Symmetry: C2
Subunit: 139 residues, 2 copies
Amino acid sequence: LPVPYTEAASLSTGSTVTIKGRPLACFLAEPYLQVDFHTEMKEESDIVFHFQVCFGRRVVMNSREYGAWKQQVESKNMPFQDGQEFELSISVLPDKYQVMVNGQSSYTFDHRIKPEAVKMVQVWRDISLTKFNVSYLKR
Amino acid sequence: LPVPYTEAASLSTGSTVTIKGRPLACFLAEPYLQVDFHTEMKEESDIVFHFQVCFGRRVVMNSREYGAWKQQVESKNMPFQDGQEFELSISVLPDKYQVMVNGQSSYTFDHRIKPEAVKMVQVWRDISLTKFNVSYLKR
């Protein structure tokens, strides 16, 4: 899959975004992974959910609203494993996103903007990607 | 050119490393560029010169010696232009590296390890690359 990876998308309660991929360097090099849920197809559009991994160090989550970054949430939780493929599953719950890493609940982020505002998902920085899916099974 | 880009290399006084490329996102997204001069072909080897651009924000330079990062040099100088191709030229002078951006002297970094210790150059993070060259014209 090409990285940066972009897909038009819609989200609501019950939606799951599944990403399978792979850092491009060992953790000692501090590769990054970024997943952004955008309100428009344009990359300068607002970001309802920003998820940024500095592999082996930290994760930051935030939103970008009317062009400006808001209060970041910083986590030191690091379930990702050096040199390994990862499977990332972001579920849209009524009150928050829930982020699973290799099947383990690892982060959550309460909705600041309704998920129905999302029109695009971008996955980029220092990863390769073998799978991307947005589920569309629920009303 | 594939990114991450790796080339075996040797450097001495008079050597020039010329990199031509292009951020993968606008500056608002804060794409990065990293150029590392390594002592071995392995990515965990020491880094004689680390050059890391956070486009539109800062540049940091450092060395990684026996596995540990040393004193970083942080610069707010930012000659790179939003959305534009750049031409980066790193010259090996007797006392320092000199970094030109689009023909303009922009950064320098005094040698901490002799440049003759370099065996590999890696260029990676959020850029595309159209040209890479190491000059080999001087004794």
